Design a protein around this nucleic acid. Structure first.
Lengths: 120, 121, 56
RNA sequence: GCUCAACGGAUAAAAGGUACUCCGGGGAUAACAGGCUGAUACCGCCCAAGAGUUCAUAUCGACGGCGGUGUUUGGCACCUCGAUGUCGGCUCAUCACAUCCUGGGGCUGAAGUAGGUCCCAAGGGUAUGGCUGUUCGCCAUUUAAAGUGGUACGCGAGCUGGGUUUAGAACGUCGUGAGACAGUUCGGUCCCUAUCUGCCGUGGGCGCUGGAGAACUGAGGGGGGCUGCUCCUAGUACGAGAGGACCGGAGUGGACGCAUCACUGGUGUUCGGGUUGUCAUGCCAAUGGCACUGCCCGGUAGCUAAAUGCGGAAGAGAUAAGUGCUGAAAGCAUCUAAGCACGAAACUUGCCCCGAGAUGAGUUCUCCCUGACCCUUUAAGGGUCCUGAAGGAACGUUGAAGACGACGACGUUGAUAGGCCGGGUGUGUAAGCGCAGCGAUGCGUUGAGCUAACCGGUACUAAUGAACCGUGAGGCUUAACCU
RNA sequence: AAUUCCUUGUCGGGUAAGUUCCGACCUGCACGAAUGGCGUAAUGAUGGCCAGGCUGUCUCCACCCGAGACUCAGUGAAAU
RNA sequence: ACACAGGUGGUCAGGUAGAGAAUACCAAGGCGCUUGAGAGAACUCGGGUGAAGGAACUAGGCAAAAUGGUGCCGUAACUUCGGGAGAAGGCACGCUGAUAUGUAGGUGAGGUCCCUCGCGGAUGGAGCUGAAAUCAGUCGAAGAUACCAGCUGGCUGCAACU
RNA sequence: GCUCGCCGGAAGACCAAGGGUUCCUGUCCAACGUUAAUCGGGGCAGGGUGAGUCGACCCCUAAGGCGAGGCCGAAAGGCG
RNA sequence: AGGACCGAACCGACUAAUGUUGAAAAAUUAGCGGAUGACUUGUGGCUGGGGGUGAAAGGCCAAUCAAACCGGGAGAUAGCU
């Protein structure tokens, strides 16, 4: 059974889950608000928010870890230069989820996941 | 230990590799390996040993890879499975000298002679 | 595997008794724009609770 | 003029194989199963010649007799030939008692130990292997015992196909030959998405008489009922010795069932590290992809067993075979007829689970609703406006609950999830820099750096105020009580 | 014996236990010399047996990872 | 019968590792296979890993597990002298540096000389490429590190064999 | 458009067979596409296939076919 | 040199599992055999039904074979359903 277990399989293997969460976190850092299904947003909190908690401290090894995750140097640069000072006083909850309407192609519960102090 | 288990022999008179044909004691006892007595065939024997190949006689397990559990939770695991050969009717040690470690679990009745002869308890 | 006798339209209706849709029964009304929305959902013009959360 | 002798004579004239088969029919007719029967088979009882030192019945029972079961070989051809799959094994069972063990007894040619035989008793239990396709059987070693039968010789819309039981091939035998064998050998396709009953789980509606939230009573129903060995009694009783108690106690096991993860481990593709080959991030360095998680080495939570705790009882009622007391019929006598007391793992309770849909719908505690009007075919009703109560339901964050419903926790009067801070754990001294070294590499910083599902804290993020359902004092008859 | 009904014949051997196997004996129901008789190195997706390694075949199952199965949206059969 | 997991002759053939047209990762180039979204029961399919035992399973080691490469030792009963034979059993494999600023070997610009004086020969002898071995160091539990890649031996029947 | 994954002695590129307009452009989404479709190999129009050197045709044969006369056969016809 | 050895393409089909209203009117996934030859494949052609062809199985002759398919006799016959 699934007792005291965390993580959502999302009907894909572990390599695909890690690849989707890397691409998804890069998209969230770049755009700062994205539309994704609600379970994927709930699992996205657990990959985007550790990167910002890393990015509160700026060092060479920390830049290398936030490169090893998500493998995108522009996302590393945004995480360390633009965000970080954006979220330094904030103690968690950098990402906020707003449930939105159902997808037309298939009835999926959808949501908007956004960084909290987005300007617009 | 189980049936179809090969064991080394601690004692001298018992010779080399032995196989457990039956787990004595119990109606459907599957696995017995601490102080239990098992019926034994001799699968391979050296001629200096008194017993010979194809001979059935009892034995007592003295070393088990599964290992005993002590009351505090300690697990003494001995590498290799070992037996001390015993007569069928008497259940007394054929071998004059026991070799290798033995456990304090074999302290009851005829196994007192085994822990007396064996060096490390 | 197969049926031995043909089920009745009565049995079809008794089986389909629980295939009846559930209405929403409550549609929340937002404060800053009185348009109705699903509760805990955006207003389809872009508001959650009193604030314009999404521009689109 | 006919052994047209198949003698009411098919023609003057005619043998076989088919497993390579095909067609029309039949349960008119065999094979499986069921059904009638029970000769046979099994079990029981009757007489008792006798064997038993003598003594028919301790135990066997001659010649004969009478039944019971459906239980083996059969008899019949009632059912299905517009299809009821064949032995065996695997998985899962369930019943009878003609009881293998354990329980209670009687006789004994029962000193004890151990036996034989018969009666009562179905609660539980009732092996693993060598051989062979095997049920069997024989054998090895267990065990308290390794029961006998029914259940389509239980069970192929559950599994298998070793066997008979197709098509290829060979051997032995038969036949001229095709081929055949109540012989052998090798090989040889096992379909089904569950409508109904049935079970196993889990829910919606309504009822239970105003509506709610909880706690229950227990009518019933289910589970569980096994047993070994060592010691004390006690080397006592018993015994010529040898040996040796089948009362009453205590410990420790085998098997089984339940729960749990503190230990011992297992897994741990979501943690850490090593490393082969290649590709990429410009490059060195550091990383990421891919190759079963690339291959490994360890591993947290969770689940788990091989790990650990516990339980099958004691007791009470009524009993069965049996054993009696008093006691007449029948002055004695007698367990029974009037009475009375014992007596088993069986029965009813006792232990554990469900359980008032227990329509016989029960009880207790608490909560909440006490406003008008109109019409009327008035035990009764319909409608309008105002009012919506306790509470439920929905929605959201979710769970050591879960297929989905359901159940439980929380919703800003907040620790419900994620995040964040600290710790624990696990891996094993990260990156970078410096030093040594020709270099691989080593040393320092450094038990460092990462670290999950864990523990303790923290409103940073999402749990919005509503809205919905539910109403407005609850029928009619009759009794203690008061007008 | 690809053949022997009785038959699981009998001796030696291999296992605790061997209706299988090997060497045989000869009492060949019912072998026999081109319907070939008997041996034979190599070869065989051939038949039978033994052993070592190896292991979830098994004792006795356990965890994890994916595709179904369950729930929601769209399309939407079958035999009977 | 289908926008069907099947069938369909020939041509071309990059890098690295590699014997290779195996295999792995990628060039050029083309694709994600025309239903998705959740949860993370039983059960089914395809896998990974398992304490102790290890064939007790079973009609039968069916299936899984296992062995696997090169170099070098070695290696039988019988034989039809070929065999059997990768028999069986095993050892060394990584990286660095030195031998040797890269050796053995290959390929060959200049210079010089000779000649049919030019697509000529000769010590032609700079660069380029370069395997294997020995010694010493060094890392990990493990160097065929992945994919790839044999299980082995004995007795018998039949058929000589492909 | 940016990432990710897959093939890469192909799932890449080209000839042959075979198909026959499926190629390109515009418009549409009734039916087909196992879903939605703005998309399509779907509907509807309009375009597009340019050779002395590439194939065919052609010149020449193979296996073979037909085969004047001819031999044979009841007729059809067989052979050459 | 080898109807030699290991092994891809290629040819075949030994075991297992899945599928068996399939993806498929014999396929898929792991293993398997042969792989310089009694090999394999393309293009034509030839052999026609009581006939062909067969390293032989009642095998094959268009998903059809103990005598193909199509039309005719033909409304064969059917003491059978």
């Amino acid at each position: 059974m699934r007792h005291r277990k965390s993580g959502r399989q999302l009907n894909r293997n572990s390599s695909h889950r890690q690849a989707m969460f890397r691409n998804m976190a890069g998209s969230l850092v770049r755009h700062e608000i994205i539309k994704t299904t609600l379970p994927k947003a709930k699992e996205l909190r657990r990959v985007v928010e550790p990167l910002i908690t890393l990015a509160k401290t700026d060092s060479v090894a920390n830049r290398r870890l936030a490169f090893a995750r998500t493998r995108d140097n522009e996302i590393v640069a945004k995480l360390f230069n633009e965000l970080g000072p954006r979220f330094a006083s904030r103690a968690g909850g950098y990402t906020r989820i707003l449930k939105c309407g159902f997808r037309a192609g298939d009835n999926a519960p959808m949501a908007y996941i956004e960084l909290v102090d987005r300007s617009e | 230990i189980q049936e179809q288990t090969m064991l080394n022999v601690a004692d001298n008179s018992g010779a080399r590799r032995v196989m457990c044909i039956k787990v004595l004691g119990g109606s459907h006892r599957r696995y017995a390996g601490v102080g239990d007595i098992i019926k034994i065939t001799i699968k391979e024997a050296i001629p200096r040993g008194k017993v010979k190949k194809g001979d059935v006689l009892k034995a007592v397990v003295v070393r088990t890879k599964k290992g005993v559990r002590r009351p505090d939770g300690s697990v003494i695991r001995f590498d290799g499975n070992a037996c001390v050969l015993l007569n069928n009717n008497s259940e007394q040690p054929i071998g004059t000298r026991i070799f290798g470690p033995v456990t304090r679990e074999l302290r009851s009745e005829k196994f007192m002679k085994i822990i007396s002869l064996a060096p490390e308890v | 595997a197969v049926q031995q006798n043909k089920p009745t339209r009565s049995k079809r209706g008794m089986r389909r008794s629980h295939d009846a849709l559930t209405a929403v029964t409550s549609l929340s009304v937002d404060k800053t724009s009185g348009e109705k929305h699903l509760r805990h959902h955006i207003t389809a013009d872009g508001y959650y609770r009193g604030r314009k959360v999404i521009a689109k």
